[PDB]
């Protein structure tokens, strides 16, 4: 906006520092301003801190989980490796595939194989 | 002697003039 | 020939009334020396804060009494009527003499 004329260099870089940290974490959450119908996680043990929130909020719990996990506190479990890009990719790809498949226009999976190595 | 009742700075400190201090 | 004194407090109000006269006199008459600020005589009053005993932390004020001089030469009839009608003083006690 043409409102940048004001605001001294002080508020400038600071407000820009605001945008930087704001996107540093929120990028991927702001897209929805309502309580998600469910939650998907890579390791229910580590991010169990969130699991509790969804659990207390009656939000269904689905998540890929390694042996280092607590399956009893997960609604729909996803057993298997987790500390490997290989295992995580195969699951996340096919999972999101079900999302677009039930949505419309089944596209090709995102370029992950290249990032893997 | 800023206290001498008969000197230069004697009256100067006392804010006065008199004889020993020049006066019109 | 004529000389005008513009004593007053607030220099903001003094600046407006002084500049006003400068435009009025010059734009409707001969030459006029601009606003001439003089050494502002100030009444610095110091005093204690608390009512009882407190020979410290005392508070003090100051009375800003400004001064501004403006000289008009040739006595123009246009400038006399201009300053006699188009004027907007207030807290500015002015005094004029030949």
């Amino acid at each position: 906006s043409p409102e940048i004329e004001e605001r001294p260099k002080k508020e400038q870089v600071r407000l820009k520092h605001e945008l930087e940290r704001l996107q540093k974490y929120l990028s991927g959450f702001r897209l929805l301003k309502r309580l998600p119908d469910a939650i998907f996680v890579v390791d229910p043990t580590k991010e169990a801190i969130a699991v509790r929130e969804a659990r207390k909020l009656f939000i269904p719990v689905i998540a890929l989980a390694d042996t280092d996990s607590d399956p009893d506190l997960v609604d729909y479990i996803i057993p298997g490796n987790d500390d490997a890009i290989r295992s995580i990719q195969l699951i996340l790809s096919r999972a999101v595939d079900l999302i677009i498949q039930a949505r419309g226009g089944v596209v090709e999976p995102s370029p992950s194989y290249a990032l893997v190595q | 002697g800023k206290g001498d009742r008969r000197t230069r700075r004697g009256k100067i400190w006392r804010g006065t003039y008199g004889k020993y201090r020049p006066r019109k | 020939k004529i000389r005008i004194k513009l004593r007053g407090f607030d220099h903001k109000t003094l600046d407006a009334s002084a500049q006003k006269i400068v435009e009025a006199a010059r734009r409707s008459g001969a030459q006029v020396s601009g606003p001439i600020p003089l050494p502002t005589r100030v009444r610095r009053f110091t005093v204690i804060r608390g009512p009882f005993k407190h020979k410290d932390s005392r508070e003090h004020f100051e009375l800003r009494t400004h001064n501004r001089l403006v000289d008009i030469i040739n006595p123009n009839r246009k400038t006399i009527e201009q300053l006699m009608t188009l004027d907007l003083p207030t807290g500015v006690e002015i005094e004029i003499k030949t």
């Binding site: - | - | 407090f9 607030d10 009444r43 610095r44 009053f45 110091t46 005093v47 204690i48 804060r49 009512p51 508070e59 003090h60 004020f61 100051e62 009375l63 800003r64 009494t65 807290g91």
Partner: protein, 60 residues
């Protein structure tokens, strides 16, 4: 003797060496500035209020 005194201060019956200074506002016996005619106390009170023209907060 507070009331009868503030009245006597404005009397000046005998010699002039009795017309001592006397604050107007709260009528103080001392600390009466001649310029303002007020006491130091009521002086600052008004100053904060802004009822004292040209009297701004001193700072230097």
């Amino acid at each position: 003797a507070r009331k009868a005194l503030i009245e006597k201060a404005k009397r000046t019956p005998k010699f002039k060496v009795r017309a001592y200074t006397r604050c107007v506002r709260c009528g103080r016996a001392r600390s009466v500035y001649r310029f303002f005619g007020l006491c130091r106390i009521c002086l600052r009170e008004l100053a904060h209020k802004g009822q004292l023209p040209g009297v701004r907060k001193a700072s230097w």
